[PDB]
Amino acid sequence: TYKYVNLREPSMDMKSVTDRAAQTLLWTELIRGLGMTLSYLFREPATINYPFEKGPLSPRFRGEHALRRYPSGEERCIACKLCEAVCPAQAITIEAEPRADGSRRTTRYDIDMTKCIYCGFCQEACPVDAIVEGPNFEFSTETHEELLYNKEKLLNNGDKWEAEIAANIQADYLYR
Amino acid sequence: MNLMITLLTNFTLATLLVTIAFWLPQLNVYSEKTSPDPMGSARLPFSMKFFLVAITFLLFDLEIALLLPLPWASQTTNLNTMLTMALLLIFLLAVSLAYEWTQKGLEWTE
Amino acid sequence: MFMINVLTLIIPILLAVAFLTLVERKVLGYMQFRKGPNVVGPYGLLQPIADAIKLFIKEPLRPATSSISMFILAPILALTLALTMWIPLPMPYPLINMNLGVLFMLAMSSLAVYSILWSGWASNSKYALIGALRAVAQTISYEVTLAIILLSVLLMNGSFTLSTLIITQEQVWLIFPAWPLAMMWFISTLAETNRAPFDLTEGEFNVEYAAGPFALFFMAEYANIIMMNIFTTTLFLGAFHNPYMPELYTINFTIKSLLLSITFLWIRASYPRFRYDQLMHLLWKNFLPLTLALCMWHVSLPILLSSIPPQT
Amino acid sequence: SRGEYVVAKLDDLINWARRSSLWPMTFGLACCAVEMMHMAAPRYDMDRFGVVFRASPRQSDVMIVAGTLTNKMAPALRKVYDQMPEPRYVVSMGSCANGGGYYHYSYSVVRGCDRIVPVDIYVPGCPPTAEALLYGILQLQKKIKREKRLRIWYRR
Amino acid sequence: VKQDMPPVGGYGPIDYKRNLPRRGLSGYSMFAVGIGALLFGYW
Ligand SMILES: CCCCCCCCCCCCCCCCCC(=O)OC[C@H](COP(=O)([O-])OCC[N+](C)(C)C)OC(=O)CCCCCCCCCCCCCCCCC
Ligand SMILES: CCCCCCCCCCCCCCCCCC(=O)OC[C@H](COP(=O)(O)OCCN)OC(=O)CCCCCCCCCCCCCCCCC
Ligand SMILES: CCCCCCCCCCCCCCCCCC(=O)OC[C@H](COP(=O)(O)OCCN)OC(=O)CCCCCCCCCCCCCCCCC
Ligand SMILES: CCCCCCCCCCCCCCCCCC(=O)OC[C@H](COP(=O)(O)OCCN)OC(=O)CCCCCCCCCCCCCCCCC
Ligand SMILES: CCCCCCCCCCC1=C(C)C(=O)C(OC)=C(OC)C1=O
Ligand code: SF4
Ligand code: SF4
Ligand code: SF4
């Protein structure tokens, strides 16, 4: 249930002594190292051609956030603030009021993408699949406040990526 | 004469490249840099071992200077004497190395 | 006309040093299961040009130098000695055909440590000075076995003439009578140019130089690398020379020197670094005793075989 | 004019050489260092873009702040930043370098590295992937590509 | 049910020991090739 690494007492017959001395004087293990490096010289490398080739992702991937809509145009967020109670970073700021037809809807849905730890507790705490953490990861900005999303930016990410987000949720929701 | 021209050409090319390296990026009007090391301000401690390997180099390089006429010395007619003195010089270099060994001279830079 | 010959020596040296950096990054890339540079040029061929233009317009690092004069002279001396190590090299005819080209190269390579030493003292860092003293002691250490191995091999040549060293090897490569001298020579020239696994300047001296002069030190070091591979090629792997077609020798020694420079690139992507005492142990307690023993063997061996080479 | 064409072509030349030979000094602060080590790994391979792996901080061209900046190391970050030769750029990698992140309300964390150094590219994630960091590096290259140093010098 | 499971016979065997294949000549043969190269060079 255990083994002894490096507890080999070497042989002292003239065969093994001359083998070790030929290894010392003729550099056998150094040529073994050169052979392994030469072996990787003639291998096809593992380099994908980014941006033209992309690294493989799964439908569970947790990237850029997006507020979704029902298949009628109505937004799914019913202002229940579970995503900001569960948020380990307190990145989500929510303020709500009844809108002009009496629906429980948010007026403030902020996510600070520089507080966010991208762990997806908001999409798994959301009872109506409103906030999701979509598949976009290429959204680097040049300014800090461009990573401070309001409700307009998140609903635009939903409208921008819904054709992908709905298919990822369709592929994954029986594991959830 | 060709060699002096070659040395002057190589020195002139090197000085031209060094002048371009020290004066072309000086024309950048970037910014004045305000307030331009493992030891802070302590003096350099003298290492006896660095001086020992330098003097060992110097003495063995002198023994090399004695060994340098050997491709010409193999052409002699007094070959027994020449062979004896050549093996004696390389043997005295080896005795210098063995004495440098056994009196702990090759230590911590072995 | 001779000035044209000096230009056709020294400008292609600079071009081959420029593209050796690309070959290093590519060969180290593919040996590391990745690619080297292939975006900046077609197959990466514009990467050294882009990098040289980048370094020559980067801000000068502006150090407080101890001596201004030696801070200027250390790149000058490094580049001048890096270029003058090529002029006795027979390929198949040298620029300066001299009777003592071997000893000339050993002398001008012995002078190369002053650039390291002056760059180390001309910086105000004591750490850079300690690193320079380590690098100088390393280089002057391995120059000992350079001199003695080189003498022992030239006991089969008859002279210090580099052009005679091609005539010496018309029946056999000189690595076949002298492969232990060849392998200790090869590791010793690997330790001359501060090259891995002997690169303790990268393991935790010219760090106070700006991007221009540091690039000049870097290109002088790679000129020394290409030159010592060419000198090892002429010294142990002497090609066939037809006097009516010299380009046969030129193509042949070029292929052998490229393989040997790639062998430097292939060593540096294969081994970890020595500790400083470990390569001091490698010189003084392993390479130098065998070097002295083989020097005795190659003194006494042309006498016991009646194979003393001609003086002329 | 003619000189406007000359400063346009020279801006194209020097911006080409500066974006095609970026040398990064990566602050290996925290978990984002692991993903920078994947952006240097064979799949993504920064070196094929001319982006070398671990240049020294005095010859590097861009400082990748990859991890959490604490109060104890913020003067060391500013020291390494001040010791960089110009043009120097700052990529902020990950949420802690961007805006404090998961340690934003901590007593010992600088709330974003932009309180300390001027930041060019903010790379979001915890950690942002090696592909996302490579996206940020290529966006930095595009930012260098549209620099007008000599055109504004000619128009001043 | 439908769930990520191993197949009906399980998977195949997975190697996990050191495999350093012991290539090269003996030390006697390596010094023999070296001394023979020396003798051919000397002749
Ligand atoms: C010119 C073309 C290339 C030439 C060949 C070189 C290419 C191969 C390069 C491989 C990569 C090397 C990377 C750097 C490695 C540095 C470390 C290293 O190797 O250290 C050397 C090692 C150092 O020893 P060590 O550290 O391995 O061993 C331990 C040593 N002690 C106990 C002291 C701690 O070995 C040597 O020094 C050997 C040098 C060459 C020996 C040549 C012997 C020839 C045979 C003579 C005859 C023998 C039989 C007896 C007499 C018979 C008479 C008939
Ligand atoms: C001894 C031999 C030594 C050899 C050393 C050099 C080896 C490599 C040689 C070069 C190989 C090919 C290089 C091609 C580079 C890429 C050129 C290119 O495509 O540039 C495009 C760019 C923009 O053009 P644009 O009109 O906008 O394109 C839109 C099209 N609808 O347009 C531009 O950028 C403008 C044009 C720039 C052209 C630069 C060409 C490269 C110069 C390199 C220097 C060496 C020259 C060769 C020396 C040896 C041969 C004499
Ligand atoms: C700090 C200062 C600046 C530092 C940077 C620059 C200096 C350092 C780098 C350059 C070093 C220059 C070395 C000059 C002499 C080299 C030795 C030499 O000339 O050997 C070659 C040759 C001997 O071969 P041989 O075949 O015998 O001669 C032809 C006749 N058959 O001999 C000949 O062919 C002889 C030819 C005629 C005599 C030539 C004399 C040259 C000028 C004097 C030396 C120049 C260097 C002075 C400064 C050195 C500083 C280290
Ligand atoms: C009077 C008017 C003229 C004034 C003086 C200027 C003289 C000519 C100077 C060189 C040419 C200037 C134009 C530079 C390129 C402009 C166009 C450009 O940026 O093209 C981009 C293209 C690559 O596109 P990229 O954005 O990199 O895309 C990523 C991959 N999809 O880029 C490419 O395809 C490669 C671009 C290569 C640039 C030219 C080659 C390098 C410079 C060679 C000459 C200078 C250096 C000489 C030798 C120095 C020492 C070795
Ligand atoms: C004008 C002739 C060329 C001048 C020298 C500049 C180009 C060669 C050195 C540049 C360089 C390259 C390419 C390089 O790849 C590199 O990284 C390993 C360096 O830093 C250690 C360099 O200095
Ligand atoms: S996004 Fe979901 S969890 Fe958050 S307030 Fe809206 S409905 Fe509730
Ligand atoms: S992924 Fe996590 S840290 Fe980010 S908003 Fe959702 S719950 Fe908050
Ligand atoms: S942003 Fe997150 S994952 Fe990245 S270094 Fe910070 S704590 Fe680690």
Swiss-Prot record, chain B:
Keywords: Electron transport, Membrane, Mitochondrion, Mitochondrion inner membrane, NAD, Respiratory chain, Translocase, Transmembrane, Transmembrane helix, Transport, Ubiquinone. It is found in: Mitochondrion inner membrane. GO terms for biological process: mitochondrial electron transport, NADH to ubiquinone. Its main location: mitochondrion. GO terms for molecular function: NADH dehydrogenase (ubiquinone) activity. Pfam families: Oxidored_q4 (PF00507). The chain crosses the membrane at residues 3-23, 50-70, 79-99. It catalyses: a ubiquinone + NADH + 5 H(+)(in) = a ubiquinol + NAD(+) + 4 H(+)(out). The keyword S-adenosyl-L-methionine does not apply. Signal peptide: none annotated. PANTHER family: NADH-UBIQUINONE OXIDOREDUCTASE CHAIN 3. Core subunit of the mitochondrial membrane respiratory chain NADH dehydrogenase (Complex I) which catalyzes electron transfer from NADH through the respiratory chain, using ubiquinone as an electron acceptor. Essential for the catalytic activity of complex I. This is NADH-ubiquinone oxidoreductase chain 3. It comes from Ovis aries.
UniProtKB/Swiss-Prot annotation, chain C:
GO terms for cellular component: mitochondrial inner membrane; respiratory chain complex I. InterPro entries: NADH_UbQ_OxRdtase_su1/FPO, NADH_UbQ_OxRdtase_su1_CS. GO terms for biological process: mitochondrial electron transport, NADH to ubiquinone; mitochondrial respiratory chain complex I assembly. Keywords: Electron transport, Membrane, Mitochondrion, Mitochondrion inner membrane, NAD, Respiratory chain, Translocase, Transmembrane, Transmembrane helix, Transport, Ubiquinone. Its EC number is 7.1.1.2. It is found in: Mitochondrion inner membrane. It is an enzyme of class 7 (translocase). It comes from the Eukaryota. The chain crosses the membrane at residues 2-22, 68-88, 100-120, 147-167, 172-192, 211-231, 247-267, 288-308. This is NADH-ubiquinone oxidoreductase chain 1. The lineage of its organism: Eukaryota, Metazoa, Chordata, Craniata, Vertebrata. The gene is MT-ND1.
